[PDB]
């Protein structure tokens, strides 16, 4: 039995991705959520629409929670076909929380939590599997505002995961020390975490090509657009159903497709990083 899984599945874009996968994906779809009550309520919402998602708890900030999910997927399915890393957090527009606190809080979940899910679950991905990391067009605004030296580092085709980890930790520590402008950083803390998600996706796509050549796995970062969810607000352009389109596209690329792979994709089109 084939299996697809979405992180941060109880609301927002992640719930919409789950719904579309329940309609389209040939196999089981696992809705995950950090809070069991909110995950179960979202499964009941989808069951009221005629769909049958499975549920498993997952808090991407708890490595034990990630490992419990890893063990469940190995036991029940022998691995994983589709992984959508959707979970993320942000501060509201004009939120008065100090910039160094926004940096530490956003970085912990959006970069290091997503990275731990990839560390634990990438080895489970089966041939013809797809992995989708939900990034944001805020990563482009952040990248363009970096110093030219940071832009070169973040665009490099040879950067390692450990080098990227050093940069993400350096951003957080530079905000605490009050030196992030002199050190070449932009001034959106969420946007730097999404630079991290985009570059992590590039590194992981290169690793899959080098080490799993022939297994036909495709891994991409994506931008869902501005979507009416609790992260954003009712002015946002897209419904959750519309925001889900590009992630669903990337999750369901036909077997044997040669790409996109390692791309940063918006409205189903590759953007130059
Ligand atoms: N305009 C937009 O909405 C927009 C634009 C570009 C990119 N994005 C990206 O789209 C993705 C979905 O965001 P959204 O707009 O749908 O936001 P949302 O409505 O706030 O949903 C975020 C989801 O992530 C979950 N989450 C947060 N921290 C988690 C953790 N530690 N472990 C597991 N799940 C966690 C939330 O769970 P709880 O219910 O427990 O909080 C919720 O299920 C995020 O990566 C976001 O950066 C959004
Ligand atoms: O206007 C600003 O500089 C501050 N606010 C934001 O960028 C705002 C925080 S929520 C995270 N993202 C960017 N913001 C949004 O409202 C759009 C949703 C989200 C995104 O585009 O990724
Ligand atoms: Cl976006």
UniProtKB/Swiss-Prot annotation:
Keyword field: Acetylation, Cytoplasm, Lipid metabolism, NADP, Oxidoreductase, Phosphoprotein
GO cellular component, one term: extracellular exosome
Domain of life of the native organism: Eukaryota
Record EC number: 1.1.1.184, 1.1.1.196, 1.1.1.197, 1.1.1.71
Control of this protein's activity: Inhibited by quercetin, rutenin and its derivatives.
Binding residue positions for substrate: 136
Organism: Homo sapiens
Protein localization: Cytoplasm
Quaternary structure annotation from Swiss-Prot or TrEMBL: Monomer.
Described function: NADPH-dependent reductase with broad substrate specificity. Catalyzes the reduction of a wide variety of carbonyl compounds including quinones, prostaglandins, menadione, plus various xenobiotics. Catalyzes the reduction of the antitumor anthracyclines doxorubicin and daunorubicin to the cardiotoxic compounds doxorubicinol and daunorubicinol. Can convert prostaglandin E to prostaglandin F2-alpha. Can bind glutathione, which explains its higher affinity for glutathione-conjugated substrates. Catalyzes the reduction of S-nitrosoglutathione.
The reaction(s) this protein catalyses: a secondary alcohol + NADP(+) = a ketone + NADPH + H(+); a primary alcohol + NADP(+) = an aldehyde + NADPH + H(+); prostaglandin F2alpha + NADP(+) = prostaglandin E2 + NADPH + H(+); prostaglandin E1 + NADP(+) = 15-oxoprostaglandin E1 + NADPH + H(+)
InterPro entries to which the protein is assigned, alphabetical: CBR1-like (IPR045313), NAD(P)-bd_dom_sf (IPR036291), Sc_DH/Rdtase_CS (IPR020904), SDR_fam (IPR002347)
Protein name: Carbonyl reductase [NADPH] 1
Modified residues (Phosphoserine): 26
Residues bearing the modification N6-1-carboxyethyl lysine: 235
Example GO biological process: glucocorticoid metabolic process
Tissue and organ distribution: Expressed in kidney (at protein level).
Family stated for the protein in its record: Belongs to the short-chain dehydrogenases/reductases (SDR) family.
Gene Ontology molecular function terms on file: 15-hydroxyprostaglandin dehydrogenase (NADP+) activity; 15-hydroxyprostaglandin-D dehydrogenase (NADP+) activity; carbonyl reductase (NADPH) activity; oxidoreductase activity, acting on NAD(P)H, quinone or similar compound as acceptor; oxidoreductase activity, acting on the CH-OH group of donors, NAD or NADP as acceptor; prostaglandin E2 9-reductase activity; S-nitrosoglutathione reductase (NADPH) activity
Binding site for NADP(+): 6-30, 59-60, 86, 190-194, 227-229
SUPFAM superfamilies: NAD(P)-binding Rossmann-fold domains
Record-listed glutathione binding positions: 91-93, 102, 189-190
Active site annotation, chain numbering: 190
